[PDB]
């Protein structure tokens, strides 16, 4: 009797490319590509397990632009330039980026503490600031290849910085190839999401928010977004087809968000399986175990992720010693394995790129320990999404209805319902009345709605500029 374990790492970035200037206004796609988007599947070169990945189409677009050398990234230019060539504004951007990342373990360089305590930085000090910002985001592969430059920790030259930059772009250029390879070799399945990561249930029926939060205020949805919901799905199928040669059979619904209407739409567009959140299951069925394969109306297969295990990795274990965290995770799997008569299916689903910057050494001790341990536990079998979808010796259940929601507490309050988030929806609704091109789809991404109210969110002025620029461009 085995326990079936399914990792599904979700990779996504909103479009940071300003449509009028073509400039990438934030470097987050660059830094997560060099740190995470190649290196997370690249663990499969060293560990004999299965790991699955979701890539959103808008992320794939940006990875391609960087790999082709076409991305004009404003923060990266401030890093690349000889400090003598820096604008005052670029020096300011470098310093503020450092300040906003200073406390993360991946920024744990003595030289950074030195530089940030200096009243004034000369050329050699700025060169170190530039190069250490680059190296702070170094991924697992290049942390070994560039270990000597990392251990320097200071006194970098322009040549050395340029060497690191070239190696970083090599990693980006190999990134889509590694997803194809692990897919073709059967080491993992690759899924995608509706194109710009929107909240499909709201686009189909904004009143679905009242299924869980009756007291929320929402704006007057005076236009229909139902066709756009279809377009997000169809365009995502086409993008995946371009990259991998086949249409996608699995999708990750953004924010784990489902509803009866959304599940019907995924079915109608030919999607065979998705996953969503355990809280949705609890809200939808009086007594239900998350370790079964569910069939929604016999139309589409649904797995509900194990929220505790997913949250332990995403939120908890950065604060633990790495062996203890792995011991805790395996011990929880042991309890699941011993608690049921059948073979349970355990979905661990979370973002694959955002938690590691808070772990010691970029989560590498944790993941190397975890994967090394997993491959040696005879009673755990890790599965691709394909294997989980088709596995015969598991328990199944049919369900007829779900209560619409997301993995945020089973509801939509992270993106709608306060005065400021609703203002953005009003802007989008009014722009949709006059939209003439697919930039209105870009503006429907969930990324433009989560930060309104999150005191503590860095660069919200840039997100506001991007959203409003996409909305204006959509009407031309």
Ligand X SMILES: OC[C@H]1O[C@@H]2O[C@H]3[C@H](O)[C@@H](O)[C@@H](O[C@H]4[C@H](O)[C@@H](O)[C@@H](O[C@H]5[C@H](O)[C@@H](O)[C@@H](O[C@H]6[C@H](O)[C@@H](O)[C@@H](O[C@H]7[C@H](O)[C@@H](O)[C@@H](O[C@H]1[C@H](O)[C@H]2O)O[C@@H]7CO)O[C@@H]6CO)O[C@@H]5CO)O[C@@H]4CO)O[C@@H]3CO
Does 459 bind ligand X (CB under 6 A)? Our answer is yes
Give yes or no for a contact between 394 and 342, defined as CB atoms under 8 angstroms apart: yes
Give the footprint of ligand X on residues 172-231 (CB under 6 A): none
Does 420 bind ligand X (CB under 6 A)? Our answer is no
Binding residues with ligand X: total (CB under 6 A): 21
Cβ closest to ligand X, residue 57 vs residue 83: 57
Question: 250 - beta bridge partners?
Answer: 273
Q: How far apart are CB 354 and ligand X at their closest, in Å? A: 5
Of 9-17, 43-51, 318-326, 386-394: span binding ligand X (CB under 6 A): 9-17
Q: How far apart are CB 235 and ligand X at their closest, in Å? A: 18
> Given phi > 0 = left and psi -120 to 50 = alpha, else beta, which region is 185?
alpha
Cβ closest to ligand X, residue 28 vs residue 356: 28
Cβ closest to ligand X, residue 47 vs residue 107: 107
Cα separation of 362 and 382, whole Å? 23
Does 28 bind ligand X (CB under 6 A)? Our answer is yes
Binding mask 244-273 for ligand X (x = CB under 6 A): -----------x------------------
Cβ closest to ligand X, residue 126 vs residue 348: 348
Binding mask 98-137 for ligand X (x = CB under 6 A): ----------------------------------------
Give the footprint of ligand X on residues 288-327 (CB under 6 A): 314
Q: Which of 98, 257, 260, 446 binds ligand X (CB under 6 A)?
A: 446
Q: Which of 249, 450, 464, 468 binds ligand X (CB under 6 A)?
A: 450
Can you read off the two tokens belonging to residue 279? 């809280």
Give yes or no for a contact between 273 and 300, defined as CB atoms under 8 angstroms apart: yes
Q: Which of 14, 57, 188, 363 binds ligand X (CB under 6 A)?
A: 14
List of residues 6+ apart from 342 with CB closer than 8 A: 1, 291, 394, 395
Does 414 bind ligand X (CB under 6 A)? Our answer is yes
Q: How far apart are CB 239 and ligand X at their closest, in Å? A: 17
Q: How far apart are CB 468 and ligand X at their closest, in Å? A: 15
Residues that bind ligand X (CB under 6 A): 10, 12-14, 28, 32, 255, 314, 351, 353-354, 408, 414, 446-447, 450, 454, 456-459
């Amino acid at each position: 009797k085995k326990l079936f374990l399914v990792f599904w790492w979700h990779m996504h970035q909103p479009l940071y490319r300003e449509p009028y200037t073509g400039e990438y206004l934030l470097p987050w796609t660059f830094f997560h590509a060099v740190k995470d988007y190649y290196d997370m599947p690249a663990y499969l070169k060293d560990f004999e397990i299965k790991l699955n990945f979701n890539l959103t189409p808008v992320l794939i677009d940006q990875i391609q632009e960087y790999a082709q050398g076409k991305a004009k990234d404003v923060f990266l230019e401030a890093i690349r330039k000889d400090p003598d060539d820096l604008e005052k504004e670029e020096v300011e951007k470098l310093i503020e980026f450092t300040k906003l990342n200073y406390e993360k373990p991946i920024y744990r360089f003595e030289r950074i503490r030195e530089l940030m305590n200096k009243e004034k930085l000369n050329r050699e000090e700025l060169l170190d600031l530039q190069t250490l910002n680059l190296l702070a985001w170094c991924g697992r592969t290049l942390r070994k290849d560039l270990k000597d430059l990392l251990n320097k920790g200071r006194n970098y030259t322009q040549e050395e910085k340029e060497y690191v930059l070239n190696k970083y772009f090599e990693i980006i250029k190999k990134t889509l190839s590694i997803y194809r390879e692990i897919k073709e070799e059967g080491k993992g399945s690759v899924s995608t999401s509706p194109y710009y990561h929107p909240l499909i249930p709201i686009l189909l029926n904004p009143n679905c928010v009242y299924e869980t939060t009756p007291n929320v205020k929402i704006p007057d949805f005076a236009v229909s977004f139902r066709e756009d919901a279809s377009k997000h799905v169809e365009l995502a199928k086409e993008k995946y087809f371009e990259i991998f040669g086949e249409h996608p059979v699995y999708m990750w619904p953004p924010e784990a968000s489902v509803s009866n209407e959304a599940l019907e739409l995924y079915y109608e567009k030919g999607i065979n399986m998705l996953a969503t959140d355990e809280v949705i299951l609890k809200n939808s069925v009086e007594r239900a175990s998350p370790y079964l394969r569910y069939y929604f109306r016999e139309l589409i297969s649904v797995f509900f992720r194990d929220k505790t295990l997913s949250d332990l990795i995403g939120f908890s274990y950065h604060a633990w010693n790495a062996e203890d965290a792995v011991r805790d995770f395996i011990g929880r799997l042991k309890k699941i394995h011993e608690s049921v008569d059948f073979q349970p299916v355990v979905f661990v689903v979370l973002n694959g790129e955002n938690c590691w910057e808070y772990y010691e050494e970029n989560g590498i001790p944790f993941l190397e320990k975890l994967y090394s341990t997993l491959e040696k536990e005879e009673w755990i079998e890790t599965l691709t999404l394909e294997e989980a979808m088709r596995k015969e010796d598991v328990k199944t259940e049919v369900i007829e209805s779900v209560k619409a929601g997301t993995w945020f507490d089973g509801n939509f309050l992270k993106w709608i319902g306060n005065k400021e988030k609703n203002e953005y929806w009003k802007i989008l609704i009014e722009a949709k009345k006059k939209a003439k091109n697919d930039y209105i789809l870009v503006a429907e991404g969930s990324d433009w709605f989560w930060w309104q109210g999150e005191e503590k969110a860095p660069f919200v002025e840039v997100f506001d500029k991007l959203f409003r620029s996409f909305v204006r461009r959509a009407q031309e």
